[PDB]
Design a protein around this ligand. Sequence first.
Ligand SMILES: [Ca+2]
Lengths: 223, 57
Amino acid sequence: IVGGYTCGANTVPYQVSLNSGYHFCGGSLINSQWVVSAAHCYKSGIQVRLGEDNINVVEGNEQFISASKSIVHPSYNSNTLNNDIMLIKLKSAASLNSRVASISLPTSCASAGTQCLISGWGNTKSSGTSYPDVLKCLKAPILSDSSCKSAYPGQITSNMFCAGYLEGGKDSCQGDSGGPVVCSGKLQGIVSWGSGCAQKNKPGVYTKVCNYVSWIKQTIASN
Amino acid sequence: PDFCLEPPYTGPCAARIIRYFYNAKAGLCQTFVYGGCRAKRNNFKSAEDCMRTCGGA
Ligand SMILES: [Ca+2]
């Protein structure tokens, strides 16, 4: 997260880290056995880390639980990035507490201008590389589909939305993928892609979760 | 053009996935951050795979 702030320990209790010997993506806990992330975060052997603040130190609230299933959307397109969503089943159920909690799925899509909370352990620099120990947070608005298509001609599908600031300085960045965009208490987005980080005229692009609620619920219930 | 001589490509996706690329200026396979999508060919999952494909380019 570029241009954000330190969230504070366990203030975003639905945020998880996906670990393959190191943090490589985020995710969002949606019930005690299931996480939502990005399809481009698929790896075999994922370990989900819950209750984290400092991802480099064991601090006392962590639960480390292997993925038992990592299910990429059946229509994910790895060239257009359409349908960039994955569901991860936990091999055992997480213990829910004040620091490990689920986030609600949306009942309707959000409108342009809605302010949301984006979080992750990704790079904090727009030119160079700095990865944080603790979780970072950013408040940013959803942008109109027209502005998103103007920023990225020919690239925005009905399953994507832009969020951020056209002047630059505030964005998701490498290591944030798969993590949450939460608006009024609902998981509306998944960190997906952009063009650089926090550059002028290049807002972040997010998977539009409200289009997938039926698929999420049925896939979870079938697995 | 030899794909082993192209600079490493993070791409547009926002993951922080460690991959290997052949660095011809150093004569070594080296690590870099891949964002998870739209990989170019100088992008390997292990040093051994990189060395096999690109060593000596
Ligand atoms: Ca920790």
